[PDB]
């Protein structure tokens, strides 16, 4: 495993991408 | 701990998310 | 190498940048 | 040091923030 801030941030940068893309569509 | 660029960047990707979301609302 | 979530996220933050920039233009 | 993809990505997430903020203003 890695540290929970690093991992958490990673997931965020995925979720925030979907939201942004969804908004555009 | 980790390195301050890595950690700092992590926090940014959270703050930038809130700002973006807040703007949408 | 590093872990595939970390690396994958890195690439995303690049692709998402291009898309955003392209949209602005 | 860390790996150049990780570091590079970190900087990007800062630059992309400024650009986004500047655009809003
Ligand atoms: N946006 C990023 C969040 C976190 C730190 C850095 C590298 C990875 C993980 C993607 C920038």
Task: Record the tokens describing residue D16, joined without a space.
Answer: 């992309």
Name the residue facing C13 among A2, A7, A13 (closest C-beta). Answer: A13
CB neighbour class for C13 (10 Å; exposed up to 12, middle 13-18, buried from 19) = buried
Q: A8: how many CB neighbours lie within 10 A of its CB?
A: 14
* Cα atoms in the 13 Å half-sphere on the side-chain side of C3: 8
Task: Say what angle helices B4-24 and A4-24 make with each other, to 10 degrees.
Answer: 30
> What distance in Å separates residue A13's CA from the closest CA in chain B?
7
Elucidated via: NMR
């Amino acid at each position: 495993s890695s540290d929970p801030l690093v991992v958490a941030a990673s997931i965020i940068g995925i979720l925030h991408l979907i939201l942004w893309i969804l908004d555009r569509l």
